Amino acid sequence: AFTVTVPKDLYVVEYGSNMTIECKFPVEKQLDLAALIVYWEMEDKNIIQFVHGEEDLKVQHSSYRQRARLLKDQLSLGNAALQITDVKLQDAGVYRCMISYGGADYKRITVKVNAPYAA
């Protein structure tokens, strides 16, 4: 059946860095953007809502505005990759990626953020 997988279900990230978290989904030949849905969320917060090839930014949570990007070039490889820049302490938690292309699935990914500490 249609299955999403995660290479890594835990990312440990430095405060202030950029992170790219990924989920894999099955692709064959044409990927019809009309039929594809990619959604990323954390807690009650929408991050990406990519539907019929368009992102709805109206629904995106304010904390991710101008910080969050779907790497849409990765989609032909079967990779829904979310890049978050300038990672905050508040970015730590459980993220969900949901992909629909006929069938639908999701997975969890945990992000831990290391607070700034001088060696």
Binding site: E41, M98, A104
Partner: peptide, 13 residues
């Protein structure tokens, strides 16, 4: 959309 996977719900907007 309103999609349910393993008793978790995903909804637009």
């Amino acid at each position: 959309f309103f999609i349910v996977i393993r008793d978790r719900v995903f909804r637009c907007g």
